[PDB]
Amino acid sequence: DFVPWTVDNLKSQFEAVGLLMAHSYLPANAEEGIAYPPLVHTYESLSPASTCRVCDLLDTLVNHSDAPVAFFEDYALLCYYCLNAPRAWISSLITGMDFLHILIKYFPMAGGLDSLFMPSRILAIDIQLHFYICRCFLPVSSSDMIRNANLGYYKLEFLKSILTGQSPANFCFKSMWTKADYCGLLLGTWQGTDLLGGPGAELALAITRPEAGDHSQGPCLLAPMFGLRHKNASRTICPLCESLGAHPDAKDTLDRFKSLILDSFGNNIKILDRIVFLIKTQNTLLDVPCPRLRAWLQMCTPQDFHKHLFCDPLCAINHSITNPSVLFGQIYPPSFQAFKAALAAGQNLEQGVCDSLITLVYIFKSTQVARVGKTILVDVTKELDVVLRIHGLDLVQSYQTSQVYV
Amino acid sequence: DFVPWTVDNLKSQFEAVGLLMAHSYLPANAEEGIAYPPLVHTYESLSPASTCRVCDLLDTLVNHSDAPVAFFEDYALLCYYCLNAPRAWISSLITGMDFLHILIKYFPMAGGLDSLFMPSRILAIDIQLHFYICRCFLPVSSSDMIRNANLGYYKLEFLKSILTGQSPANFCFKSMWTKADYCGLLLGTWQGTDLLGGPGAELALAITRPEAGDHSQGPCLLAPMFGLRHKNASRTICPLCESLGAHPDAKDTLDRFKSLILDSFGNNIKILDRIVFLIKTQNTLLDVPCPRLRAWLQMCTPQDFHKHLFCDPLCAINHSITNPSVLFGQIYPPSFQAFKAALAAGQNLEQGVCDSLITLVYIFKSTQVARVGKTILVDVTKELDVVLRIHGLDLVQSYQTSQVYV
Ligand SMILES: [Zn+2]
Ligand SMILES: [Zn+2]
Ligand SMILES: [Zn+2]
Ligand SMILES: [Zn+2]
């Protein structure tokens, strides 16, 4: 009956997504003012000795009387879907909305599920920290909590570094270490600087904005970079990584585009020039089925295509971990209950990507965004190169894409 | 019908070469003034995320209707010639003029081919960046754009370093890494300080000069060093490397001169002394056929002969890559169309020199001209020595020729 990533489950809860997207703007003034509640709650959530608020809520609910069965099955299904989504803005939003839907469905007698997304309660950074960064649902053996704890320390330290804007104090790298789109939601909001492209029922109902925060950067705190800075006409919220999660025909379109770039030229023209030419003269952003897709896609600067396709490591992880047949595909009903039960017992939740790889990617993005020295950059670049080559990817040398794009 | 390096194709387009040589003077005042248009356009062209203007023009022309055939054949012929020319001033000028000739011939309905060489359009640095530095016409396999992109980043960074006058900020070397002469054109212009030698229809029609720029350094921005600085009576525009490209009997004359130096002495006299004696007492710069050649050659200080013949690496690359039989020799007509067609399909365009070698040479010239530390100079010297010895050359140790000549 319930299946995640169904747009209806989000279209019927606008009173909640409004409050979520309203409590996730960065402060308007550069200086915090007096004390911006979302930022202080986030800084408390990234503490090294704090408790995951999602797990805390789950235990204060389930460990009461008569926790209904099939709740663990719906939770396992939501976790299986979040295991196959790109780390981006639309993914966090959809996960939050579907989590709230499950809670309102099965546990109606709970206390404050009508105001869940407020400070001192579950917010966006908590949803990310539970479902995507340091996932808290994969089955693990008892003798395997040590390496995970250590990598968790490094993860959280460098995330706090990304957020605060200054590299960690004490760290030397060496000697350490369902068929329905969402494009209306993306195009509806995001009238800030997130497009900068050529020009510049979801769209109608996606019009609201707060005032206490910077309404030019948009809902940053949902993104996996906690901000929107841009250099050389490339930004820290890759819109292609939203398209990967907001439409079924996006990953295949980008694969076809990459094949065209690689194969439709014989000269030694630089790849950015190939992209600019394929987009400019022989328009390949018109022969796309959805009007909203190619309307939100033809307003992406070619530097962004270059970054996403050939340069950035996080975009490669997204492009290689998503699976739009699971997010926008029906499941054989005769096997549905069997699959639900198998997930409840923890049988198919495959890790996906490694954990050292994610920590290394976050370290790299931290040194790419915030300030950094030299002897750490030149070394994290080499290590990222070797690890990415091992794991089965092929991107340009990382020093270039660390000094050119942001 | 059309063949490159024919002096007639340049003698009939003086209204264009005048504007090209007028828009390529360094600014008169040391400080830019307000904003010197050529310099700002160049700084935009050496950006790490910009588009090659030559390829952009070629696509905005050819990818329109009825791009005539045999245009790709003439373009392939021009590229084959530029594949066999010395990196110098006369080479860039001739390539620009012949490119404009081809464009005016085949694409007459184009928009502004009468004012092509203006700022915000094709200029000299763009011609160099297309035809000589990071050549954009060699056929390459699809799986070979990565190493090329990385080397391109380093190339452009250190070229910008040569131009701006300060070494790159973030760089640690270790842990990284047709029978008709042109001599009238050279002797006609270049009444600045480019000769400093003994004394001090092309020449008649080579008299024009702008006023907004430094008319003492001459058209620097065509050279491969973007300036004319000189130390110890040796300059950064090697005139011998112009002779290599402006006369058929130049490479053989210099080879004979080198053989005389090496073989006509038994004592242990230093090589600069051998040069000074061979030029002074037993004049060997009179028994030269062309009057213009030995008139423009006997005004070259012996330090310059020494540099070009035995010391500098770029001059060795020039002396070993040029091929004056291709630039000043007729082709067997029964095979002309076959050769043109074979070039159009990309069959004979051999790379020539490596790409790491060119990047290393530019790094060396950058540290030789601009400011630099120590731990980078002493190491690039060793690496250049080893690479040059591998590639089949024999020059003096590079530290000396880095501290003595400029
Ligand atoms: Zn948790
Ligand atoms: Zn992306
Ligand atoms: Zn080019
Ligand atoms: Zn020379």
Q: Nearest to residue B328, comparing CAs of B246, B234, B269?
A: B246
Of residues B136, B142, B346, nearest to A269 (C-beta): B136
How many other C-beta atoms lie within 10 A of the C-beta of residue A75?
19
Q: Tell me how far apart the alpha carbons of residues B92 and A241 are, in angstroms, rounded to a whole number.
A: 44
Q: Tell me how far apart the alpha carbons of residues A62 and A106 are, in angstroms, rounded to a whole number.
A: 10
- Tokens coding B382: 């060793």
Beta strands in B132-279 (DSSP E): 230-231, 234-235
Of residues B49, B55, B346, nearest to A269 (C-beta): B55
Q: A266–B346: do the CB atoms touch at under 8 Å?
A: yes
Q: B48–A263: do the CB atoms touch at under 8 Å?
A: no
Q: Tell me how far apart the alpha carbons of residues A391 and B53 are, in angstroms, rounded to a whole number.
A: 38
Ligand number with the minimum distance to the CA of B87: 4
CA of A357 to the centre of ligand 1 (A): 20
- Tokens coding A108: 């109606």
B349 has a chain A CB within 8 A of its CB: no
| DSSP-based three-state secondary structure for B234 | strand
**N-terminal to C-terminal alpha carbon distance within chain A:** 43
Q: Tell me how far apart the alpha carbons of residues A169 and A167 are, in angstroms, rounded to a whole number.
A: 6
Count chain A–chain B contacts defined by CB atoms under 8 A. Answer: 79
Q: B139–A282: do the CB atoms touch at under 8 Å?
A: no
B49 has a chain A CB within 8 A of its CB: yes
- Tokens coding A341: 């039960």
Ligand number with the minimum distance to the CA of A134: 1
Burial class (CB in 10 A: 0-12, 13-18, 19+), A327: buried
Burial class (CB in 10 A: 0-12, 13-18, 19+), A150: exposed
Q: How was this structure determined?
A: cryo-EM
Interface test with A, best of B132, B146, B151, B155 (most A CBs within 10 A): B146
Query: Any bridge partners for residue A378, and if so which?
Result: none
Of residues B136, B153, B172, nearest to A268 (C-beta): B136
Label residues A261-300 b or e (16+ Cβ within 10 Å = b).
beeebebbbbbbbbbbbbbeeeebbeebebebbbebbbbb
A276 has a chain B CB within 8 A of its CB: yes
Distance set, CA B404 to CA A37, A376, B73, B88 (Å) = 65, 36, 46, 22
Q: Nearest to residue A134, comparing CAs of A143, A121, A147?
A: A147
Q: Nearest to residue B19, comparing CAs of B147, B116, B133, B128?
A: B116
Any alpha helices (H) in B224-355, and if so which ranges?
Answer: 239-246, 250-263, 271-280, 291-297, 302-306, 313-321, 324-327, 336-344
Q: Which amino acid is at B206?
A: A
Q: B146–A382: do the CB atoms touch at under 8 Å?
A: no
| DSSP-based three-state secondary structure for A68 | coil
A263 has a chain B CB within 8 A of its CB: yes
Provide, as residue numbers in chain A, all residues whose Cβ is less than 8 Å from the Cβ of B130: none
Instruction: Yes or no: say if A366 and A162 are a contact pair by the CB < 8 Å rule.
Output: yes
Q: Tell me how far apart the alpha carbons of residues B271 and B268 are, in angstroms, rounded to a whole number.
A: 9
Ligand number with the minimum distance to the CA of A128: 1
Our CA angle for B242, B245, B250, nearest 5°, is 90
CB proximity list for B32: less than 8 A, separation 6 or greater: B39
| DSSP-based three-state secondary structure for A276 | helix
DSSP state of B127: H
B63 has a chain A CB within 8 A of its CB: yes
Provide, as residue numbers in chain B, all residues whose Cβ is less than 8 Å from the Cβ of A270: 52, 134, 136, 149, 152
Residues across chain B: 406
CA of B287 to the centre of ligand 4 (A): 21
Ligand number with the minimum distance to the CA of A50: 1
CA of A87 to the centre of ligand 2 (A): 9
CA of A52 to the centre of ligand 1 (A): 5
Query: Any bridge partners for residue A196, and if so which?
Result: A300
Q: Tell me how far apart the alpha carbons of residues B121 and B36 are, in angstroms, rounded to a whole number.
A: 15
Dihedral angle of Cα B129, B134, B139, B140, to the nearest 10 degrees: -140
Q: Nearest to residue B120, comparing CAs of B46, B40, B55, B59?
A: B40
CA of A241 to the centre of ligand 2 (A): 4
How many other C-beta atoms lie within 10 A of the C-beta of residue A45?
20
- Tokens coding A15: 């009173």
- Tokens coding A169: 């104090």
Q: B51–A382: do the CB atoms touch at under 8 Å?
A: no
Distance set, CA A390 to CA A174, A351, A378, B4, B110 (Å) = 20, 18, 19, 49, 50
Pairing of strands A234-235, A230-231: antiparallel
B14: phi then psi, degrees, rounded to nearest 5: -70, -25
A272 has a chain B CB within 8 A of its CB: yes
| DSSP-based three-state secondary structure for A133 | coil
Q: B172–A394: do the CB atoms touch at under 8 Å?
A: no
Separation in Å, CA of A320 to nearest CA in chain B: 19
CB proximity list for A340: less than 8 A, separation 6 or greater: A70, A73, A76, A77
Q: A232–B150: do the CB atoms touch at under 8 Å?
A: no
Separation in Å, CA of B205 to nearest CA in chain A: 38
Q: Tell me how far apart the alpha carbons of residues B12 and B105 are, in angstroms, rounded to a whole number.
A: 13
Interfacial B residues in 115-134 facing A (CB < 8 Å): 134
CB proximity list for B69: less than 8 A, separation 6 or greater: none
- Tokens coding B359: 């990047």
- Tokens coding A234: 């490339």
Ligand number with the minimum distance to the CA of B307: 4
B346 has a chain A CB within 8 A of its CB: yes
Q: Which residues crowd ion ligand 2, with CB under 5 Å?
A: A 238, 240-241, 308, 315
Q: Nearest to residue B185, comparing CAs of B294, B38, B293?
A: B293
Q: Tell me how far apart the alpha carbons of residues A127 and A134 are, in angstroms, rounded to a whole number.
A: 11
- Give the residue carrying structure tokens 């007698």: A109
Any alpha helices (H) in B322-376, and if so which ranges?
Answer: 324-327, 336-344, 356-369
CB proximity list for A91: less than 8 A, separation 6 or greater: A82, A85, A132, A245
- Tokens coding A356: 């050292």
Query: Any bridge partners for residue B213, and if so which?
Result: B27
Distance of CA A49 to the CA centre of its chain: 24
**A234: enclosing H helix or E strand:** strand A234-235
Instruction: Yes or no: say if A310 and A395 are a contact pair by the CB < 8 Å rule.
Output: yes
CA of B104 to the centre of ligand 3 (A): 20
Q: Tell me how far apart the alpha carbons of residues B105 and B91 are, in angstroms, rounded to a whole number.
A: 21
Q: Nearest to residue B350, comparing CAs of B78, B53, B17, B80?
A: B80
B29 has a chain A CB within 8 A of its CB: no
Separation in Å, CA of A372 to nearest CA in chain B: 11
- Complete DSSP assignment for A160-226: HHHHHTS--SS--STT-------HHHHHHS--SSS-BSS---TTTT-----SSB-TTT-SGGGSSSS
